[PDB]
Write a protein that binds this DNA or RNA. Structure first.
Ligand SMILES: [Mg+2]
Ligand SMILES: [Mg+2]
Ligand SMILES: [Mg+2]
Ligand SMILES: [Mg+2]
Ligand SMILES: [Mg+2]
Ligand SMILES: [Mg+2]
Ligand SMILES: [Mg+2]
Ligand SMILES: [Mg+2]
Ligand SMILES: [Mg+2]
Lengths: 63, 96
RNA sequence: GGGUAGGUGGUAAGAACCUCAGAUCCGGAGAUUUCCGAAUGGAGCAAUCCGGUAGUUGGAAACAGCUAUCAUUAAUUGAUGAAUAAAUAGUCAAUUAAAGCAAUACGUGGUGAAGUGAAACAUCUCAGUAGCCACAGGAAAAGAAAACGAAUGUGAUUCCGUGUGUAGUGGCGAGCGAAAGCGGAACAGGCCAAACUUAUCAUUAGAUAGGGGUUGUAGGGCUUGCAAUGUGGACUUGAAAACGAUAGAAGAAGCUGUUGGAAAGCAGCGCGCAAAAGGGUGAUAGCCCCGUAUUUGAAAUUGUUUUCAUACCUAGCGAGAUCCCUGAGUAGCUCGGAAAACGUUAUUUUGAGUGAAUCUGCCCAGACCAUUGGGUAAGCCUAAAUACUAAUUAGUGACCGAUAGCGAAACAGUACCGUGAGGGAAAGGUGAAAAGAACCCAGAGAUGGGAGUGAAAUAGAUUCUGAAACCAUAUGCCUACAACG
RNA sequence: UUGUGGUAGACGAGCGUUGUAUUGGAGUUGAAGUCAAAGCGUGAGCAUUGGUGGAUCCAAUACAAGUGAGAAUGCCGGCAUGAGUAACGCUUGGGAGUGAGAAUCUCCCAAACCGAUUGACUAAGGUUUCCUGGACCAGGGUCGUCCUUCCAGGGUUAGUCUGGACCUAAGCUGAGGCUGAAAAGCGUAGGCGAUGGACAACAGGUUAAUAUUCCUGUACUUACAGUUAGACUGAUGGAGUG
RNA sequence: GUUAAUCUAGCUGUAACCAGUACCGAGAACGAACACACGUAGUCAAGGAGAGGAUCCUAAGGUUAGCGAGUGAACUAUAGC
RNA sequence: AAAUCCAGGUACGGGUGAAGACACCCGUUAGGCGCAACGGGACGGAAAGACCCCGUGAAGCUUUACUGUAGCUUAAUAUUG
């Protein structure tokens, strides 16, 4: 699954409304990056996490 | 109960036979038939005088305790104090 | 428990028995419940094959009987344990949940066409329709205002009518089409986070379990007093009662005559009614029967409601003051898109980026600013009205009546076609009752002709009626030199 | 008095059907439906009598509709015509018997094709078609006493054969895991998967039908204990062979 | 493993499970809508002449090609000339 | 058995005719009914003409026809010092 693991925010499906307004179905994929994390039992883990939650992790100092 | 039980006397109210008093032998309650001995003897041609069933509507019980051995209806409502359900004639009081 | 006197399911007579010490039958509750199948010991060509483990029995032992257990995954608990010393991954064990099916229906959510319309066509419509997929549920979803929106105003949601085919929106074409307001069905609003306080965690807590507190004419906490013992339910356990659902019991009243095969008709004289709804009975029955109206009744299981007690939750008016709290990668802003009636626009959502404030606040009243006015997001929960009926029961029809009506009145999704998905038919009626036509003649026999039963055998098993096309026979008339819709 | 041909097409008045409602009424002394007849109407249509048939039905006024058939290379069923025409899809002669009936069946004797086959053994398939007795609705391109059809009864017998209980190939599945809006896809360990590898039985006889299976005669194998003697065995792993 | 397990050779005794096994294997049982001239893996494969499984005739064995009987015109096919 | 078939008691010449006649007009010829044959005709039968044209019809294919797009490549921004 190309959704992240902390939350489950998945792709968003929309239209590729070009000039002259021809419609074409298209997908938006979340930005996934392999940044680490540290749990409160040790067990440092590597999880595919999206960037929006990466910022939240960065400010709550969960690394 | 049942208005007609095996054994009791019974007569015919309608049909080719009138006042054909006789005894009942078998009753098929599912299909509403009776087999009265001495009545409706059809000459079977087997490749014999076996009887022919008579529908329970035609049959009617036979009073035998009244001087006029006439024909009448039946009550069940009489449950005698020292007895179970019994048959008693409406236009009389004669058990069975 | 009911309930009587027969019964051993239909094509079904006979044979052999059970039964009126109360069987069969009907209703409630139970037990048994081979094998496959989510299939789950391991396999597998579905309904078969091959086992392990622990007991017990037999056996000298392989081995065979007879029992129970043996899948995976997630959570929790315990044990064990790596590269590496500790630790985690992993492995083993124990306990508790589901995995599937279907009511072709209804609900939500994801994804999502085309035919067609535009008299072509791409924007658009068909359409967020069908289909695929996940997920439940007895209903779901939604929901208690950062609202409507123009006012001395309404005061959660949902659903019906109207507003109206309006304001608007649309290659301003085809087309699309609200939100207010109003009349109605139904009506309930509750609870956390955080301030503060308590106990404990090498208390580095920034964590665990308590108290407390729930918001807008702003509220709550912090300091201090008064009044309270009570309604209230979105709700736990018991007891009692009522009304039902699941078998059933009683349940009035008629004879005579004629046609007649049989009268229940027709006719004469009666009769009963909280019953003249219906079905059968040799032809059309109020009184022959079975019921119906009515009156009734449950050991056992189950439903709705009510009452009494029973927990948990829940209660009110004031005084002090720069005290503290009032949901952060959040609301916004930008780039691409969409829900909303709106083809992107206030409002609402978001894949990418950036990013605030804290009651003198924040958002809102179709770009926007000021004034005025309304409401307090960024946390959760919620019965009712609403949608649907494959199912159980009672019943209805100016609905069909065997080329109809469900594809299917019968052993129909059968036979049959196809490798397979899948496609997919036709046909019923003797008579009131077999009294299913013993016997005789012909014939090998089916069968036929007499007989016989019966009202009728032109009702005969080819079985209600029995047209037409069609094929044969026959009285009567015409036709073999004649060109003929 | 003036008119009355007529498709497309406008307008008017009407017949019939099925059922519901109320009102009258006929019916086993024979209802509807069905045929037949030398009737009545301006038309759609409507009576009368008789045979058959064996229980429902007719008229008056409104009402409601699955409401009116000669055509759709219409659908379903039946029936003709073409026609007793083409066809009948590789082969004979007779004796005796049976039987009501024989070219067609049973037996016999020839005759004619096959013979790297129309013969004999089996795999794949098919699923009782096999054997005995009986029958002649239907099927058999004729007939039939007969059929591979139908009916009643019957037959398939393994330590060694084909396959499991042993093995693996292509490949299939696939715990954890990887990837993917969803379903699913990929794939490791394990597990399956013969067309192949490894494993011990020969000859003859018998029944209507079975046969390395049953029987007779002679054999081998793989396990299990108990026993005598000898010897220290030596795998879930390494190697050789296969 | 020795205070004997396990194997080897022999003797006595015991056991050897599950499905298939008929018949057809095609000018009539299979796939061709059929009792249709077509198709379908492998095996055995006699004698004379012959290089031979070719070719002609026969054997072991097996079949009567499930409509006949005539006539011997046109005409058609097939052979012969 | 079959395809066919508006009912049929289904002549020929000249002419006419929706323009080439079994039926019409005017002449001509011909007893009723089969059987074997052969094919001139009945614009014979089988096929809603394949050619052609028409439809604001379909599909396949092409391209420097239009509009878009899977891919490939380039820059800003996040991942990120
Ligand atoms: Mg404004
Ligand atoms: Mg002919
Ligand atoms: Mg001929
Ligand atoms: Mg011929
Ligand atoms: Mg062949
Ligand atoms: Mg072969
Ligand atoms: Mg040879
Ligand atoms: Mg040869
Ligand atoms: Mg033609």
């Amino acid at each position: 699954a190309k959704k992240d693991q902390l939350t489950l925010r998945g792709p968003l499906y929309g239209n590729n409304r070009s000039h002259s307004k021809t419609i074409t179905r298209r997908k938006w994929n979340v930005n996934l990056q392999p940044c680490k994390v540290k749990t409160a039992d040790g067990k440092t883990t590597r999880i595919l996490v999206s960037t929006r939650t990466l910022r939240t992790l960065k400010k709550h100092n969960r690394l | 109960m049942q208005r007609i039980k095996k054994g009791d006397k019974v007569v015919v109210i309608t049909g080719k036979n009138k006042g054909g008093s006789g005894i009942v032998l078998k009753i098929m309650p599912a299909r509403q038939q009776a087999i009265v001995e001495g009545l409706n003897k059809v000459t079977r041609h087997k490749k014999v005088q076996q009887e022919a069933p008579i529908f329970l509507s035609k049959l009617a019980l036979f009073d035998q305790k009244a001087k006029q051995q006439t024909i009448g209806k039946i009550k069940y409502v009489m449950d005698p104090k020292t007895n179970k359900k019994t048959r008693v004639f409406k236009k009389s009081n004669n058990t069975l």
